[PDB]
C-alpha cells in the first residue's frame, strides 16, 4: 500500500463549517439569495428515506424503523409537495446526480420507487447520463427490485453489510443471509450496476483482529467495486439502540488499531487502492484517477467526481450544500410535515459561509481529498499570501510536521505516507471554530 503504518504517530471533516455551526436564523430568504448565486452551476440531488424494517443497534443514521409501511406512502405524499415548492426554483438547472440515502430507501416497494423517481423526473431536468445511486439493505427484499431500479434508472448501488460474523449479526440485531447477499451483489452485477459499494463496520462488539480477518477473506470473495469500512462511533446517550450493545464486548483499542492494520494491508493485497478516510475502491476507479489527477472532490455522501454543483436535499434531515450556504431540512419528522403543509418546504436552520469559511472550506477539502495543498492556486483565486493569511494555522501545523505527518514549505503543503491516516489531526488546524 502508499499508506505507511506508524504505531507511536497514531498517539494523536463532515463538511466545513461543520453542523454545530448551523444556525435557525438562517432563513428562506437566505436560501433563495444562496439558489440564486450560480444559475449555471451542475444540480445534484439528495433525497433521505428515512424507514427501515428493524432496528440495528449500532446505528448512528437519521432513520425511524416501522412496520407500518403506510408510513412510506405518507412521506411520499410529503416529499410530493416538498418537490413541488422548491423545484421550480432549481427550472433552468441539469442535474448531473441523484442520490437516495437513509435509512433505508429500499424500504420503498416498486409502485413507491417509481413513484417517487417520476416525481423527481417530471420536475427537475436530468442529464442523459445523470449517475443515480440509491443504498439497500440486503433483507426483506426481492432479487427483481434491482431489475426495478434498473429500469427506473439507478446506476450505482451501496449495500449495508457491517459483518458477515454471526455473533456480531446476533449481537447487533442484524441477522443476514449471507448466501443472499452474495446473491444480491453478484445480480446487481450481471444487470449492469457499476461501482457497487459495500459499507462495513469494525470496532463492533465481539469483533477482534482474527474474526475481521476473517470477514475480509469472504468480502474478497464477494468482490465489491468498493468498500466503506467504518469506525465505530459508539454513542448510548445520543443513540439509544447502542445501549443494547455491552461496553465490555466492544474491542480494545490496540485491537481495533490491529484490525485497522490489517484491512488496509489486505484490502491493498485484494487490489483495491485505500483513497481515504473509510473508503477503497479499485486503481482504475474513476474516484481512484481523479484523485491521483489532483481533483477529487467530496460532498455530505462521500467522495466523487463532481466537484462545483449545487446540492439540493429532500426530505427529513435532509442538507442542501447550495451557493455558498449549506441548509438543512427539520430532522424530526412530525415537524418536516408540519412545516412541508404549511410553507411548502421544511427549512430549519443553516449557515451562509464567510469569505474565511469558503477559502478553509477549499484548503480542507484539498487535503481531505488530493492528500496536498498547492498555495498558489488559493492565493489566485481569493487574492491572499498564504503564510499570512494562515500563519496562526501553519504554527498549530508545525509540531505534526516536525513529526512527518506532512511535508512543508513555502509553495504548498504534501500529506506524507505517514500523515494519511492522520488527515483530520492536520485538517483540524485550519478549524477557526474549535
Ligand atoms: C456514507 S454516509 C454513512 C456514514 C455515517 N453518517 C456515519 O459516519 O456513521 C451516507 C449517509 O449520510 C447521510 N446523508 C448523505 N447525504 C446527506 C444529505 N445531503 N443530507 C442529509 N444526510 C445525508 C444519509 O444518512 C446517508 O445514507
Ligand atoms: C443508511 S445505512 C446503509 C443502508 C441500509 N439502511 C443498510 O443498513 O444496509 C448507512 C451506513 O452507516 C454505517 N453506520 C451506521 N451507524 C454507524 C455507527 N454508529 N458507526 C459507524 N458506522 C455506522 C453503516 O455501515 C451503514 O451501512
Ligand atoms: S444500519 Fe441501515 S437498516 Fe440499520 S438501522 Fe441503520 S439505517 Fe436502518
Redo the contacts with the bound molecule.
Keep these: 500500500q502508499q499508506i505507511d503504518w506508524d504505531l507511536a504517530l497514531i498517539k494523536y471533516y463532515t463538511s466545513y463549517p461543520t453542523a454545530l455551526e448551523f444556525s435557525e436564523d438562517f432563513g428562506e430568504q437566505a436560501f433563495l439569495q444562496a439558489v440564486a448565486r450560480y444559475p449555471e452551476r451542475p444540480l445534484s440531488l439528495?433525497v433521505?428515506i428515512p424507514f427501515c424494517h428493524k432496528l440495528c443497534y449500532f446505528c448512528?443514521?437519521?432513520?425511524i424503523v416501522t412496520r407500518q409501511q403506510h408510513k412510506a406512502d405518507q412521506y411520499l405524499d410529503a416529499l410530493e409537495q416538498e418537490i413541488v415548492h422548491r423545484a421550480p426554483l432549481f427550472a433552468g438547472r441539469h442535474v448531473s446526480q441523484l442520490?437516495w440515502?437513509?435509512?433505508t430507501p429500499t424500504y420503498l416497494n416498486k409502485a413507491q420507487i417509481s413513484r417517487l423517481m417520476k416525481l423527481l423526473r417530471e420536475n427537475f431536468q436530468f442529464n442523459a447520463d445523470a449517475e443515480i445511486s440509491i443504498?439497500v439493505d440486503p433483507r426483506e427484499i426481492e432479487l427483481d427490485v434491482l431489475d426495478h431500479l434498473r429500469a427506473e434508472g439507478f446506476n450505482r448501488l451501496?449495500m449495508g453489510v457491517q459483518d458477515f460474523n454471526k455473533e456480531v449479526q446476533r449481537l447487533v440485531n442484524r441477522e443476514q443471509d449471507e448466501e443472499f447477499i452474495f446473491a444480491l451483489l453478484n445480480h446487481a452485477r450481471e444487470i449492469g450496476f457499476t461501482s457497487t459499494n459495500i459499507?462495513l463496520i469494525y470496532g463492533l462488539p465481539k469483533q477482534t483482529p482474527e474474526s475481521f480477518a476473517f470477514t475480509l477473506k469472504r468480502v474478497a470473495e464477494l468482490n465489491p467495486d468498493r468498500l466503506?469500512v467504518?469506525n465505530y462511533?459508539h454513542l448510548p446517550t445520543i443513540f439509544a439502540a447502542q445501549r443494547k450493545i455491552k461496553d465490555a464486548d466492544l474491542p480494545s483499542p490496540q485491537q481495533k488499531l490491529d484490525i485497522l492494520q490489517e484491512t488496509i494491508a489486505f484490502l491493498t493485497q485484494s487490489g483495491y487502492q485505500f483513497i481515504g478516510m473509510?473508503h477503497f475502491a479499485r486503481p482504475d476507479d474513476e474516484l481512484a484517477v481523479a484523485q491521483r489527477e489532483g481533483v477529487l472532490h467530496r460532498?455530505?455522501?462521500?467522495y466523487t467526481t463532481q466537484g462545483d454543483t449545487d446540492?439540493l436535499?429532500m426530505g427529513v434531515?435532509?442538507?442542501?450544500?447550495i451557493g455558498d450556504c449549506y441548509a438543512?431540512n427539520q430532522k424530526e419528522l412530525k415537524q418536516y410535515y408540519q412545516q412541508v403543509d404549511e410553507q411548502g418546504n421544511a427549512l430549519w436552520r443553516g449557515i451562509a459561509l464567510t469569505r474565511d469559511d469558503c477559502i478553509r472550506r477549499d484548503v480542507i477539502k484539498s487535503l481531505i481529498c488530493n492528500f496536498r495543498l498547492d498555495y498558489s492556486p488559493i492565493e489566485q483565486q481569493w487574492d491572499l499570501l498564504f503564510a499570512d493569511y494562515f500563519a496562526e494555522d501553519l504554527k498549530l501545523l508545525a509540531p505534526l510536521a516536525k513529526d512527518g505527518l506532512v511535508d512543508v514549505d513555502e509553495k504548498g503543503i504534501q500529506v506524507t505516507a505517514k500523515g494519511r491516516l492522520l488527515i483530520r489531526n492536520i485538517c483540524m488546524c485550519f478549524d477557526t471554530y474549535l
Design positions: 439528495y433521505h448512528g443514521c437519521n432513520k442520490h440515502g437513509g435509512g443504498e451501496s459499507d466503506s467504518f462511533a473509510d460532498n455530505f455522501q462521500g446540492l436535499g434531515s435532509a442538507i442542501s450544500m438543512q
